[PDB]
Structure formats: structure tokens, C-alpha cells
Amino acid sequence: MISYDNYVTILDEETLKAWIAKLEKAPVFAFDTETDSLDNISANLVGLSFAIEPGVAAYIPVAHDYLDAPDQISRERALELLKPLLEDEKALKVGQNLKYDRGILANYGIELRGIAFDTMLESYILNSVAGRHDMDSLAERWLKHKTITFEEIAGKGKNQLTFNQIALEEAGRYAAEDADVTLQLHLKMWPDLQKHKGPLNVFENIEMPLVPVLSRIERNGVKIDPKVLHNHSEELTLRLAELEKKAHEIAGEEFNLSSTKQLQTILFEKQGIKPLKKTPSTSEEVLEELALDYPLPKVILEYRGLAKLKSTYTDKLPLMINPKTGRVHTSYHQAVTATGRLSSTDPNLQNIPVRNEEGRRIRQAFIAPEDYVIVSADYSQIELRIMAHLSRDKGLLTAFAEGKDIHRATAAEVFGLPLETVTSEQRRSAKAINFGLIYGMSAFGLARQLNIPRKEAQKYMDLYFERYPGVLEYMERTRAQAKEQGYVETLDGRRLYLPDIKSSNGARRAAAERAAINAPMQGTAADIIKRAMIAVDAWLQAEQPRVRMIMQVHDELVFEVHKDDVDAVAKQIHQLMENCTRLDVPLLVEVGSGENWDQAH
Ligand SMILES: [Zn+2]
Ligand SMILES: [Zn+2]
Ligand SMILES: [Zn+2]
């Protein structure tokens, strides 16, 4: 178990000051905060926990207020006494998801420095795919110990308690164990993180410095016009009604716009061919093939998409606005992807359609406050630029070197014709090939995205590898070391472990071969992006210009910049991104500005 004996509950200044003194000479210490809510900007600190050594940890309750809650040190007094320590860059702290913690402190004008070790990130850099990187999963894996779960002390469902309603001693068992367990996890993982200079570098210079930048980006939030969102909502109801009428009008009677039920009984029953089309999907979409001549499938296609988008963003978004800030604060996840790229949720900015008009309207709702503008800094096909570098191809490298559209250069060489004459269908065939390589796409998969016959696709790829031989080598070389060492790495050292590389299973090992070729390019993009955020954020913190970094999505960073400052700030973001990262990959940053995210994008 864990009883009231394990950890102390600090209820008086004299004891806190005693701990503070010990904390000041500890080589590194684990620190934690407990709040009344998951919402960072509006949560109130209910208490703090520390651990100076395994088994030696304490819980400092400051704001429990249930009926008859014992006297506690006031939140204001505990913070003023703890502030010097917390803001000391020299006092090294350890924690699980320090991002959340740094933010809560910032609610009180305290700047958490010495953000040295985050056990979540230690775990993530050691092996991103080992499993879940949360403390409960970690403790069970490295310490064969099952931690006290939040549900165990608070409950479940709607009648779940908030931390401030939990008895002091129960609150302490949970809090103090978090502190203690975190320290123990660091003591086991930190040594391991040193057997390799690759992972080490990434964790030290990329992941750790990013913890406070993510916090600031999350807390800053993004201004969303709910009116716009609402109009778009009303209009999408009218358009969904019209499309339903247009579907009924093409044939007869009423029916749902669901395949393998109401569509097949119409579509093929009135000529076409039997099978359906899955919503597997991004490889064979029977519905959009007919769409070139057939009208009905076209309207069902465009219908579903609009219905998805409406409930996903148009209806969801306005409800995410925070009463306290009046802005939306998305959740970025640093230890979730296998390759190392930041993911996002509530909302998942990365699922907002790009090459589609309706997604563009979603983006128009992402607006700049009065006297400011949204500025978009993007890494133009950074992953393609990464592949050129990693494959040491003079062709590709030169295409970018002289500012040429790699898709048209590629086709100009693959199809053998002048660059100014390359057709849209050729540029489109080249691009399908270019992008297929990154994802390690099969010659048949390429045939499925391009709609050409098999072996016709195999013809194109053969021509590609002969004109760009350095790419075949890279591809093979990567599938080689991936089998040998069981992992692949990015330019900075980040690793992706491939456990099924020698699987003995067919498709499971194929997946591992695709991930192998892919990860090095994606992971490197991720590293480049993280390094850029740190760099730009460092300029922001030091120089304090009139700019806020508000989003990170795909290969772009989004800001709000003062309208009178646009030019000088844009020159700067441009230099920080294409120069203060990796000087080995030929990078290009496209900077745009507007009144909303769509205008700058
Ligand atoms: Zn915590
Ligand atoms: Zn905790
Ligand atoms: Zn893998």
C-alpha cells in the first residue's frame, strides 16, 4: 500500500523552511503540484509535493477547504517562501510532465526555472514506442510498483471530487508518492539515457528546453471567432439539406447516405459495378472514380465530408473557448508520436483539412486580436529537403539549390523533358512518387494514388531511381541498419525502435520496413521544428517584441504579431527558423500574414 506513515504532511512554516533548506543542497529534487482542475489557465493550486531522496518526500497542502479542513499554510505564504527556490535556474528539478507544473506556477507570477528532467520525456527518448509514458505506466515498468490512481482518491463520474475536497492525509499519499516515484524513475532512467550520445542530445537540447515553450504556447491560446463558426454551422445545415435533396432527385425515394446499405441498392442497381467504398480508404475510393462522370456518387462524397467537418470543428470549436481567457487552448502532446513530432488534441489542429475549401473556412475563424495580425511561418516541404540530404543526391539538392519546384524538376528528369514544359499530370505523377518514398510506399500503392495500372507505376519508380540513384541507396542502407541494430535515427540522434523488423510475419515486417525509411525524415523534421520553437521562443523571452506564438501544426508555426511590427518581426522569424536550427539540411521558410489563419496560410 502506502499509508500516512510514508510521507510527511507539512502544516507549519517552520517545517516547510526546514525542507526548503534541505532542498537547497539536494543535487536534484522531484517537485509536483496538485490543483482543483485539469484546465491549466483556470486551475487553482491546492498544494505542492517534494522528494529529496527515495522514500523521503512531503506534501504541503495550501488550499484544501472541505468542511473542517485543518489549518494549513496559506497558498500565498507557501509560494512566497518557495518562490526563490522555484525560480532558481541552479536548483535542478525533476518531474512527470513538468509542462503542466510550470504553467500552474505562472498563474501566480512565478517563473519555474531549472526545468532539468521530465521523467515523461526521459522515458520517451529512451524508447518512444516502449509503451505509455505516463507515471502510472512507468512506475509499473521500471519500479514494478503500482501507483495510487487519481480515481482511487477522487472517485469517478460526475460526483468525482476535486483535489481540494480530499482529506489532507489522502491527498498527501497521492501527491507525495508522485514526487517520490518521479525521483526513483529519474534515478533509473537518467543513467540509461547516457549509454548513447544520440538520445542524450535530443533529450537535453531538444526535448527539455521545449517543456516551457509548449506551456507558454498552450496558455497563450488562439483567438477564435465563434460568430463565424456559428454562421458556417447554419450554412452547413442548409447545404446538408440541399445535398440530400440532390441525392434523392437523382434517383427516387428517400434513403440514408450510408454505403453497404442504401447506396449499393441504387448506384450499381442503376449501372456500375457491385463493390462498395470504405470511409483501405485512401487506396481505393470507388465513389470518387465514378465522380469523374457519374453525378450521384459525387454528391454523397461531398456530403459525408461536410457532415464530419461540421460536428468535428464547427460545433465543437466554439465550446472550447475558455471563459477566463476567451481563447481556445489546445493540448500539445510531447511524448506521443513514434517519430517525435508533436501531436495535438482539443482541438486536433492537424485534422483541419488543408487542400479543401471548407477547411479554409475553419481557418478563417482563427483570428488576430485588434491591431495584430496572424503570421504563418512554414518549412516548405522540409521532409523532401531532408530526403535530398540523407540520400546525398546532387539532382535533388541542386533542384532546391536553385529554387526550382522539385516536383517539376523530378518529372523533368523522370519523364525526360524541359522543365518549362512539364504538364500538370506529370508534375502530379512525380509528386506521388516523391511523397511515396518518404512513407516507403509500394509501387502498387503508388499505382492506387495515381490511378495508373500496376507495373506502369513500377516503370516510373525505376526511372526515378536511375535518375536519382542516391535515393535507392538511402532506402536500402536504412533497411539494412534497421535490421542490424533494431532501430533507425534522425540527424540529431533521435531513435525509432523497430521490433518487427525481423518479425517473421509478412505485413507486420513490411510495416517495420516502411517505418524505417520514414522515421529518419519525419523525425528530423520534428527535431528541426522543435529546435525552431526553442530558438524563436528564446528571442521572444529575451527581446519581448509584440508577438505571441500561438500554434504549431504540421511543418508550420503560427503567431499573432502587432500590425506595425510585421516586417521586422517577419524577417526575424524567418532568420531564426532557416538559420538557428540544422545548417546541413537546405531549409526554406515561407512567411505569410493576414487577418486570420487562412489569410496568412
Ligand atoms: Zn503533476
Ligand atoms: Zn501529483
Ligand atoms: Zn518502428
From Swiss-Prot:
Segments for region (Klenow fragment): 1-601
Gene Ontology cellular component annotations, sorted alphabetically: cytoplasm; cytosol
Ranges where the record places region Polymerase: 198-601
Enzyme class, spelled out: transferase
Catalytic activity: DNA(n) + a 2'-deoxyribonucleoside 5'-triphosphate = DNA(n+1) + diphosphate
GO terms for MF: 3'-5' exonuclease activity; 5'-3' exonuclease activity; DNA binding; DNA-directed DNA polymerase activity
EC number(s) stated in the UniProt entry for this protein: 2.7.7.7
Protein function: In addition to polymerase activity, this DNA polymerase exhibits 3'-5' and 5'-3' exonuclease activity. It is able to utilize nicked circular duplex DNA as a template and can unwind the parental DNA strand from its template. Genetic interactions among priB, dam, lexA, nagC, polA, rdgB, rdgB, rep and uup link the PriA-PriB replication restart pathway to DNA double-strand break repair.
Family, as annotated: Belongs to the DNA polymerase type-A family.
Name assigned to this protein: DNA polymerase I
Organism this protein belongs to: Escherichia coli (strain K12)
Gene: polA
Residues of the full protein shown: 324 to 928 of 928
